Design a protein around this ligand. Structure first.
Ligand SMILES: NC(=O)C1=CN([C@@H]2O[C@H](COP(=O)(O)OP(=O)(O)OC[C@H]3O[C@@H](n4cnc5c(N)ncnc54)[C@@H](OP(=O)(O)O)[C@@H]3O)[C@@H](O)[C@H]2O)C=CC1
Ligand SMILES: CCOC(=O)CCCCOc1ccc(OC)cc1Cc1cnc2nc(N)nc(N)c2c1C
Length: 186
């Protein structure tokens, strides 16, 4: 199995969600960036795995689930089987990561991408080890009811460039945003 990574888009006031949806209007190139980054595997014969909480799964429109070309794993302690369209179900983040190591999957998974939401991000970010955060900074405040955990900049180094990631300011629907990549190793 290769790297562990989180990916997220976040407003200036650290918001990621409101009422089961994004706080901002759809940003279609932002979403194409998310798709490209999480689908692209730097290893032949393998695909990437995406891990998400239950609410995130149901927050993605039906037409776009499962996220295609990736193994989709949902986290829940209530569900008895993966949701309609998903591939795997685990009861903790530790369980999900062990599973990638099992022979069912050890040979098939390249990168792992945590794609939401708050609890899953927090636990990954505070777990010792090598971890990258792909963060899109939406450069406006948006009313939100769900927030991204604090990034400790003592541990997470902002990378000065990263292959495949544009460094300049993007804009769609009059909303400016920029891409960042952070890395810790502890
Ligand atoms: N802007 C962005 O980049 C993104 C934003 N979002 C936003 O996130 C919002 C919802 O996310 P959030 O409220 O944080 O939900 P979570 O990310 O915490 O998802 C958890 C859901 O699955 C189960 N679950 C929760 N935590 C775990 C866990 N640690 N292990 C296994 N299963 C778990 C359920 O909890 P239980 O254990 O009780 O079963 C819960 O319904 C959405 O409205 C969406 O808009 C989502 C993705 C990306
Ligand atoms: C193809 C036809 O066009 C369509 O129909 C497009 C539907 C798009 C809806 O996608 C939603 C919606 C609500 C939602 O959560 C509340 C999540 C997602 C998926 C998404 C989108 N952008 C992201 N950005 C970052 N940076 N990081 C992420 N993790 C990320 C994720 C996970």
């Amino acid at each position: 199995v290769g790297s562990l990574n989180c990916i997220v888009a976040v407003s200036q006031n650290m918001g990621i969600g409101k009422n089961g949806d994004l706080p901002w209007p759809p940003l279609r190139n932002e979403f194409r960036y998310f798709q490209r980054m999480t689908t692209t595997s730097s290893v032949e014969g393998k695909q990437n795995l995406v891990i998400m909480g239950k609410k995130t799964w149901f927050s993605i429109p039906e037409k776009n689930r499962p996220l295609k070309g990736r193994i989709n794993l949902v986290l829940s302690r209530e569900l008895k089987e993966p949701p309609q369209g998903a591939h795997f179900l685990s009861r903790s983040l530790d369980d999900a990561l062990k599973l990638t190591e099992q022979p069912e999957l050890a040979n098939k998974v390249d990168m792992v991408w945590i794609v939401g939401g708050s609890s899953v991000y927090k636990e990954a970010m505070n777990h010792p080890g090598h971890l990258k955060l792909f963060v899109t900074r939406i450069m406006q405040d948006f009313e939100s009811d769900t927030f991204f955990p604090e990034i400790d900049l003592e541990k997470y180094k902002l990378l000065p460039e990263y292959p495949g990631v544009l460094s300049d300011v993007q804009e769609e629907k009059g909303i400016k945003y920029k891409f960042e990549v952070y890395e810790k190793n502890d």
